[PDB]
Amino acid sequence: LAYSNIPLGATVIPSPFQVHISDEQIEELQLLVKLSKLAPPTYEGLQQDRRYGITNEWLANAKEAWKSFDWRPAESRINSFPQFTYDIEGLTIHFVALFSEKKDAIPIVLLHGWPGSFLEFLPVLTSIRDKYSPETLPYHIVVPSLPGYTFSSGPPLDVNFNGEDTARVINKVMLNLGFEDGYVAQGGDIGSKIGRILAVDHDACKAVHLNACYMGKPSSIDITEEDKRALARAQWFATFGSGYIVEHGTRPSTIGNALSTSPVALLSWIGEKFLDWAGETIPLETILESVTLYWFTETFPRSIYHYRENFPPPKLRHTEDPRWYIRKPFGFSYYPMEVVPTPRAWVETTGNLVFWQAHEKGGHFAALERPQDYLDDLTAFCEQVWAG
């Protein structure tokens, strides 16, 4: 497999990995999709603008498509990229990688969120290996599955687990691969908090680029018509879009149990996000691939441990806390349909912001929606800040 040779200085050799969902898991999935019931018509379910969530119609259509969804091609595509696992602190940590043949390639770790996965970055990874050979690849790209997500095991059954533990475990992936001299982190959604913690607390992480920075407007800050739509969208998300945060953060076992009962229940909860959060419309096939993977791996109940960190609501939000001010080189890319679009003057207050790029297209799932924009920003930021 191209791009799959372990960097020469690795401290722990990773075990190679391939996904092979059993025929029985596939057919249990179809059985329960078929067994699922739909809601009767309701006023709320008939609103085509989704002001009360997904429409009954969308869900009925998506369920029918699911019955013809074939996992094998998607699984084959996933397996076309090099994948590995480490054993770290009793957990299996899965990651996708593209390793360069250049000895001093710049290591980068790309950090997904919820309800995402490594799947978000495969179009970017496809663009990378279209553009480069293993010989001309300037980067080592590492795309781990966060603890509790898809092929990563955990979190533990017997102790609480939070974002600082997540960062500690993810940093060790990069250390294991020989990157103690330095790597760059890139993060969105929950990955943006992980990226911030890596940059703030872990020596090996030399710089961090974010495409999300969840904050209110700082009081130390004065607007344009783009600043106006950013504030209106942020207020929409805070007021109407944050039910799942409160339920994940306070009753993770209840919602975790309810949505494991049926794959179509998980489809409803997760599909609403792929619909509302995107700038560029995400195809139904991409939603189904993600929900199917979460299902096969029982991700959802293992994946929501992060949300309880905000209950009770902290004095300062993470991004606004001086404890988590990013002193290392810090980059931000602005996508207008990000769930909380944040202007430069906001972001600048949370770190040492040396890189700023704004885009006209794209929303929350920047890598998935705009892989070329994402890859361009990532190359530019890494070239701009990397110090050898």
From the list 67-75, 233-241, 331-339, 355-363, the region that binds a second copy by CB under 8 A is: 233-241
| Known active-site residue 307 | yes
Q: Per-residue b/e over 40-67, b at no fewer than 16 CB within 10 Å?
A: eeeeebeeeeeeebbbeebbeebbeebe
Q: How far is the CB of 316 from a second copy (least distance, A)?
A: 17
**How far apart, in whole angstroms, are the C-alpha atoms of residue 274 and residue 279?**
10
24, two tokens: 């029985």
Specify whether 86 is catalytic: no
Q: Show the binding pattern over residues 16-55: x = contacts a second copy (CB under 8 A), - = does not.
A: ---------------xx--xxxxxxxxxxxxx--x-xxxx
Q: Which of 18, 22, 103, 157 binds a second copy (CB under 8 A)?
A: 157
231 binds a second copy (CB under 8 A): no
* Whether residue 364 lies in the annotated active site: yes
Contact assessment for residue 302 and residue 315, using Cβ atoms and an 8 Å cutoff? no
Residue 317 in tokens: 């939000």
| Euclidean distance between CA atoms 117 and 239, whole angstroms | 26
- Which residue number, 25 or 379, has a Cβ lying nearer to a second copy? 25
Residue 19 Cα distances to 77, 95, 107, angstroms: 10, 12, 25
Cβ at position 65, least distance to a second copy in Å:
16
Query: Which of these is catalytic: 202, 248, 306, 364?
Result: 364
Three-class SS state of 134: coil
DSSP symbol at 145: P
Query: Is 23:70 a contact under the CB 8 Å cutoff?
Result: no
In eight-state DSSP terms, residue 322 is G
56 near a second copy (CB under 8 A)? yes
* Binding span for a second copy by CB under 8 A among 67-75, 108-116, 224-232, 237-245: 237-245
Position among 255, 293, 340, 353 found at the interface with a second copy (CB under 8 A): 255
- Mind telling me the catalytic residues? 189, 307, 364
Give me the residues that bind a second copy (CB under 8 A), please: 31-32, 35-47, 50, 52-56, 59, 155-161, 239-244, 246-247, 249-262, 264-266, 268-269, 272, 298, 301-302, 305, 308, 311-312
